Every structure is written in structure tokens, then in C-alpha cells.
């Protein structure tokens, strides 16, 4: 299957702060790719799919961006609900990998 | 309102079999795919497998082997079995509703714990 890589693995922020996320395939995905985030003791929540689209109910502060093998995921002033993990996936051809994710803590 | 939960055997010995159940509710399993995924303790997302609305199973290359996904429609549940377990088979697993290139609804997941 391809792989994804994910940077940095964590990182510290302050709220208000942006962030961008990125996630790397090992391979051409075209696009197929959704991010979702993670908190504590809860199951993934979807953020972004098909690279740019925002879920029902996301707030506006999350964007995705890429194509090809080069995907990000950017936090415009990030609300204390926002930490917690993130983790892209593709859904090309016949495997649905997830990128190791990457974890955003409070400052 | 979907509705997926998992139910499986926490503590299990290394060499058993696991059985895992995903139990749907709102949604018919003729018209999504139902994907596998499991979380070691700290650790990522791994992707197990899926089998579609018709049937059809996809599985993750390495570990193929020791796996098998069925459903039953009747029942709407979907099941996950492994084979002879390793300690590193320790992981919260869960199952996932797919519509359109994203995985929408979610179980709790279900914390399998491989001990002998």
C-alpha cells in the first residue's frame, strides 16, 4: 500500500496561535485525502476530506491544501478545543492508510 | 443518528483467536463499506481492512494473513477475526462507517488486551 508521513510529530502552541500540518504519500494519492482529529479517550472525528472539503460543522479555521504527494492541514488561532492528534488518510486504490499523526499541545 | 459499537473479549491469551463485533444501527450495510482500524496503546491509526457494501474485502497487505472481515446483513453486524496473536495485537480497535472517500461515523472502539 503507499505510505503517509506526517511532520512534525508534535508540537507546542499557544492559543491563537497557526499551525500548518503536513502529510507526505509515498506515492501520488490525486487528491484522495482526508485529515481527522483525535481527542483523548475519543474516537477519530473527520475534518476534511477530498483534500480542501471541510465536514459539517468544522469550523472555518481549519483549511487542507496539496496534491500530488504534498498535503497540509493549516490552523488559523488555535482554540483551546483544537489540541489533540491529527491524522491524514487516503483513500487511493485499494488501502486506506493513515499517516502516523501528529500531536498539538497547549503551550 | 448511526450508530456503531464494538464489543469484543478485552483480555485474551497470545496464540488465540480474537472475534471483534461492529453492531450497526441507521444505516444499511448493503449501501457502505465497514472499516477495521486499531490504535497500540500511545501509538497511531492502522488501517486492518474493509469490506464494501457487495461483499467485497479489502485487506492491509502485511497483515492479510491472520485476517478475516464478514458480515451479516441480516444482523447488521460485522465482524473482525485474527488469528494466533501476538502481545502486539494489544490495541483499542474500531470499526468505521465509509461513504465517499471519508469515514463519517465512528464506533467508541473496543481495547483488546493480549496477556497470558
Known amino acids: 500500500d503507499i505510505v503517509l508521513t506526517q511532520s512534525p510529530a508534535s508540537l507546542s502552541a499557544s492559543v491563537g496561535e497557526t499551525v500548518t500540518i503536513t502529510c507526505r504519500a509515498s506515492?501520488?494519492?490525486?487528491?484522495?485525502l482526508a485529515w481527522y482529529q483525535q481527542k483523548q479517550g475519543k474516537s477519530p472525528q473527520l475534518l476534511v476530506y477530498?483534500?480542501?472539503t471541510l465536514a459539517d460543522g468544522v469550523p472555518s479555521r481549519f483549511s487542507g491544501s496539496g496534491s500530488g504527494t504534498q498535503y497540509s492541514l493549516k490552523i488559523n488561532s488555535l482554540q483551546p478545543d483544537d489540541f489533540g492528534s491529527y491524522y491524514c488518510?487516503?483513500?487511493?486504490?485499494?488501502?486506506?492508510?493513515f499517516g502516523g499523526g501528529t500531536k498539538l499541545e497547549i503551550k | 443518528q448511526v450508530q456503531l459499537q464494538e464489543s469484543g473479549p478485552g483480555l485474551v491469551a497470545p496464540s488465540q483467536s480474537l472475534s471483534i463485533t461492529c453492531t450497526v444501527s441507521?444505516?444499511?450495510?448493503?449501501?457502505?463499506?465497514v472499516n477495521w482500524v486499531r490504535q497500540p496503546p500511545g501509538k497511531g491509526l492502522e488501517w486492518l481492512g474493509m469490506?464494501?457494501?457487495?461483499?467485497?474485502?479489502d485487506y492491509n497487505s502485511a497483515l492479510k494473513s491472520r485476517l478475516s472481515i464478514s458480515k451479516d446483513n441480516s444482523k447488521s453486524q460485522v465482524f473482525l477475526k485474527m488469528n494466533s496473536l501476538h502481545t502486539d495485537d494489544t490495541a483499542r480497535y474500531y470499526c468505521?462507517?465509509?461513504?465517499?472517500?471519508?469515514?463519517?461515523?465512528w464506533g467508541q472502539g473496543t481495547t483488546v488486551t493480549v496477556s497470558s
Open positions: 468505521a462507517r465509509e461513504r465517499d472517500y471519508r469515514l463519517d461515523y
Open positions: 441507521g444505516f444499511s450495510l448493503t449501501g457502505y463499506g
Open positions: 469490506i464494501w457494501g457487495d461483499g467485497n474485502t
Open positions: 506515492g501520488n494519492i490525486h487528491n484522495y
Open positions: 477530498y483534500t480542501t
Open positions: 488518510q487516503h483513500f487511493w486504490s485499494t488501502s486506506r492508510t
